[PDB]
Structure formats: C-alpha cells, structure tokens
Design a protein around this ligand. Structure first.
Ligand SMILES: C[C@@H]1O[C@H](O)[C@@H](O)[C@H](O)[C@@H]1O
Ligand SMILES: C[C@@H]1O[C@H](O)[C@@H](O)[C@H](O)[C@@H]1O
Ligand SMILES: C[C@@H]1O[C@H](O)[C@@H](O)[C@H](O)[C@@H]1O
Ligand SMILES: C[C@@H]1O[C@H](O)[C@@H](O)[C@H](O)[C@@H]1O
Lengths: 314, 312
C-alpha cells in the first residue's frame, strides 16, 4: 500500500500538541534540549506513540472528578481531581503508556476552563443536572501533577464554586503565564508519576543525524491569560497527519521519505525535506526562525530515499 | 472513477463538526418539528464544503478580529464590539458567497468561551496579553458576522483592549434557560434580524417514508444553571475533512453504509448516506442508538434513493 500525506495546506492544519491552528513552519538548529514530545507522535506506518490520541479535542484535555479542595503554597484555590481515560473508562496505570492519552507533554501553567455537569438530577428542574464552569490552571511541573497515578491538581480564581464528586472536564485554552516562576518549557516533560519518578513508555527522542540538517516544526502561537510574551508550541507533525497515518497504516519502505513542499498555485517546489520513519521532518537549513512561505503550501510525498540522501539546502 | 470511501475512525475517534466536542452517541429524533439546516459540518459526498464549513477543528465556532468599543450593560456585565476577520486573518469580504465568515456559529444561543488578546505593538520587547471569559449571544441584534462585526459580553468590566488582535476560543454554553434562547436548529440572522440569510447550505430531511435523520450527538458544557444540552451534527468533522481530501465522484444519490462491529464483523444496522452529506435510518424511535463506540460506518455500495433500508 503506497504511502501518502494528506493534501491539507498549512492554513488547513492544526497542532498535535495543543488545540491551535498551525501558524508557521519553524526551525531552531541550536536547540540544546532533547526533543521528545509525547503528543503528535506517530510512525509513518501509523503506530501512535507516547500519549498521542486521535481527537483534536483530546489534546491537553482531562476528564475525571474533583475530589476535594487541597492546600498548596501557590496563589489561588487548589483542587484535586481524579482523571479517567478521555472516553470515560478508568485509567489503568499498568497500560504501557506514559500517562492517559492526551495528557500535556510539556512543563508550564496550562490555562483553560474546568466545567462540571452533576450526576444527580433535580425533579423540579425537569430532572436536569446543575452545572458550573470556571477558569483553571494546571501546573504540569507541580509535584501534585500525577496523571499516570490517576490524579492531577488544578487551581482556580474561584474560591468555592467547584463541586466535589462531580464529573469534571478540563478544556485547554492557552498558558496562564510565561513569567520566571511559571516554568514554561515546551521540551521539558512533566514527571507523570510525580517528583523524583522516572517517566516510562516514552515515545523516543528525535534529532537530525545528517550534517547541516535540523528539525522542522509546525509551530502555533499559544494564547496567554496575562503578562508579557509570545509563546509558541512546536509539533513534529500536525494532528491531521497523525490521523491520516493512523488510518492508512502504509508500510514504510525505507527509514526516510523524501517530501517536497509545493506551491499548488504555481506548481513549484519551495524546498524539500526528509520525513523520517519515526514521524518527524528534517531540512537542510542553517538558521533559526520561521520558514517564510505562503500558507497554501503543502508537503507532497515524492519517494522513499535513505539516510544517505542529501537534501537541497532550503 | 475514484472510489468513494469513509475514514475508519470509530465513534470514540470522531469529533463534532458544529462545536469543538468529541462525539458521544448516535442519535435520532423522528418527531423533530424544526427545519434542519445547520451550516457547519456541511460537505457533499464529492467533497464540496457548504454553508460556513471550514476544515479546522479549532475554527468551529471560533472568531478572530479586533475590539472597537466598550459598552457597559445597563444591569450587569460589559459588552464589547468586535470587528471580525476570516479565521486566517485576511479581511472578511461580505460580498463572498458565504452566509458569514467560515466557522461562525450556526445556532441560536449564548456561546461561552474565552476571549484572548496578544498585543501587536510594544519599553520591554514582548507584547502584553490578557484573556477573560466571554459570552456571544448569537440571537442578538448585534450579532452581525456577515456584516463583519459581532458583540461579546464579559464579566470583566475593564481589562479588554481595543485595536488589538483578539481570539474567541469556544468552550460551551452560558445557559440554556428560557431567556438564553438556545435552539440548535434556529439559525442566527447573520446580517441582523430584518435581513435574509444568504448562500445557505440546504435543509436536510428523509425523502422516503419510515426514515429519520441520524445525528452524531455531543453534550456541550454549561457555565451555570441546570441542563444537559446537546449539539447534533450531520457528519463528524473528520468526515468533512476526508470527503474534502478525497473528492470522489458520487455515483448515485445515496451511498449505502453499514455500521459494523469489528470484533464480530457483524453489521449492527445500515443507513443511507445522502449525496448532500447526511444520514438517514429506518427507525421509528427517538433517543441514542445503543451500540459499542468502537463501531464504525463502512461504505457498502451506491444505491438508489428508492432503496429500502433494513429497519433498525
Ligand atoms: C475569575 C477572575 O476574575 C478576576 O476579576 C480576574 O482579574 C481574573 O483574571 C480571573 O478571571
Ligand atoms: C501585561 C498585562 O497582563 C495582565 O495580566 C493583563 O490584565 C493586562 O491587560 C496586561 O496585558
Ligand atoms: C469572572 C467572573 O467571576 C465571578 O466570580 C464568577 O462568579 C463568574 O461566574 C465569572 O467567572
Ligand atoms: C445551578 C447553579 O448554577 C450556578 O451557575 C452555579 O454557580 C452553581 O454551582 C449551580 O450549579
């Protein structure tokens, strides 16, 4: 079965690591961190890895139940919530994944909304349940961030109106802050089972091997609740590619696919890239920053090549 | 002729095309009195997007633009006038043959979400940001997205900036009380109340007796109050994306599809997938379809509109 990519253009793609549109292609050759994100991880023959799942709505989402308000040294009102799988089934800590699928894969203060729809109903309200929603922040670097253990902590500005024991949804919106104390680092993994514990079942790190090549990312700018900053989240492949590869399950015929970024209006190749078996791109570029190209561009699969192939410089 | 196909995503791998929600259940309501004419999640089987439908899951019920004016509510809250652009940032051209900017909500209600802003200009060199909860009343006379401007309301009374890039991220509904006018089949008046909506995707309905529409239903969060609101789409967003990609010619008015249990390989029921992009089943009851969420629709064959469905 022939390998293919979707023909979605850049303006028709979304980020696999946060629910955002793709804004720009981006490189950063001098990156010192190990790149080992756990969302948006899928091999070219369709094997999901890390905490990757298929739903755009599941990325950095949680589902579970608040248990109680809990004490924390930091500003705001804090709440513990048990988390299930996103489909509502209990999370089994013995499954070979790093954390429930969809769990955030970076250090930071994730801003969003916690909502609740009670289980118990009121006969006088037409047998309908009570609801509430409030802004919330999940500090994924917190020692109380233990999604692999089945529970996480979030904070609210709201001091009282979060109910114990009720079905709870976290909808991610952006970051609370990127100030010095907010520990935003997109390449630092949370400790999924808590402070001082080793993460397990991780999708592998990715890196260029060939001289003069660097990783190519699909970058999205992420909203901020407050403060100064222009934070971005870089993914290895957009969510649509994860969905496409998963569907197709086409055998990989070598370790490296040649892809060309094409202008569909002019028919011209703007540059070429290696699409590696483990699900990431490299290009021959010697600079950091955006790739300035029209957002109607798209990657076209050309052929299977190998580690010895020399890319034309971008 | 390029063969027609559906994705092999199961129900638990699908999302709603009318609000950013996972699909929870398949659903019927044969006795629905409303005309069904939603404008998001509209795609013909040969890949033609219709209504306000666009491809991004992040674009559904999203807005992008700039705030122009602050107006205090007479009682509580603050209203903000927002010019809106296309989601890709380009100016919205009201002369384009669409009902409203793609992604515009397609139902009456108070849509609850978060307005966020990242300023354009900067003596530090990083832009200032803010976000607050917001509500967009799509039934409001000030909801005129086809004219390039809408209004949202906030609890926040001051901290929303004019002339700065603004994003609305939808989250759910503010209320489904009587005074909140939630009706998922009532279209907003995209240009205001006394004006006719234009360029609409057509209404959908069974043509053959004994059939009813089959929906992909999602439950939508509420900011407050009592309720268990739901939003029904004709096809999930992944089907819109797939059909658009494939652009396979339609070889009859109807693609017969079977909902299959892959564990047993058995067909649970069959449905008609109509050319204009919607499902009907032979069912004479309302409510969820009780089936495993690892079930999925498989394309069987092109059939005629006169084909008689096996009763569910
Ligand atoms: C719920 C809280 O309301 C306050 O007025 C705001 O200043 C905070 O940002 C937060 O939204
Ligand atoms: C930099 C400042 O951050 C704060 O949280 C906001 O409330 C202000 O509007 C401003 O953007
Ligand atoms: C910003 C507003 O803060 C208040 O405390 C809350 O009661 C409202 O629901 C809203 O979130
Ligand atoms: C019915 C009530 O709606 C309000 O908005 C909420 O703040 C309460 O917790 C409760 O659910």
């Amino acid at each position: 079965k022939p390998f293919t990519l979707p023909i979605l253009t850049l303006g028709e793609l979304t980020n696999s690591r946060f629910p955002l549109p793709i804004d720009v292609l981006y490189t950063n050759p001098n990156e010192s961190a190990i790149v080992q994100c756990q969302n948006g991880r899928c091999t070219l023959d369709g094997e999901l890895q890390g905490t990757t799942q298929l739903l755009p709505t599941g990325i950095c989402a949680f589902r579970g139940k608040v248990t109680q308000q809990v004490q924390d040294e930091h500003r705001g009102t804090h709440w513990n919530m048990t988390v299930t799988n996103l489909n509502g089934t209990p999370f089994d800590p013995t499954e070979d994944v790093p954390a429930p699928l969809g769990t955030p894969d970076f250090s930071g203060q994730i801003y969003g909304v916690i909502s609740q729809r009670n289980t118990n109903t009121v006969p006088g309200e037409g047998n309908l349940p009570a609801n509430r929603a409030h802004e919330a922040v999940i500090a994924t670097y917190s020692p109380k961030f233990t999604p692999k253990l089945g529970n996480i902590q979030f904070s609210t500005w709201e001091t009282q109106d979060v109910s114990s024991g009720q079905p709870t949804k976290f909808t991610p919106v952006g970051l609370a802050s990127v100030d010095a104390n907010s520990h935003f680092d997109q390449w630092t993994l949370p400790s999924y089972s808590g402070a001082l514990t080793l993460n397990m079942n991780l999708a592998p790190s990715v890196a260029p091997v060939f001289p003069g090549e660097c990783l190519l990312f699909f970058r999205s700018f992420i909203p901020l609740k407050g403060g100064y900053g222009n934070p971005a989240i870089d993914c290895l492949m957009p969510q649509e590619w994860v969905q496409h590869l998963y569907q197709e399950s086409a055998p990989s015929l070598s370790d490296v696919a040649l892809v060309r970024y094409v202008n569909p209006e002019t028919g011209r190749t703007l540059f070429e890239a290696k699409l590696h078996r483990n699900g990431f791109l490299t290009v021959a570029r010697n600079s950091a920053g955006p790739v300035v190209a029209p957002t109607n561009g798209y990657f076209r699969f050309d052929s299977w090549v190998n580690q010895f192939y020399t890319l034309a410089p971008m």
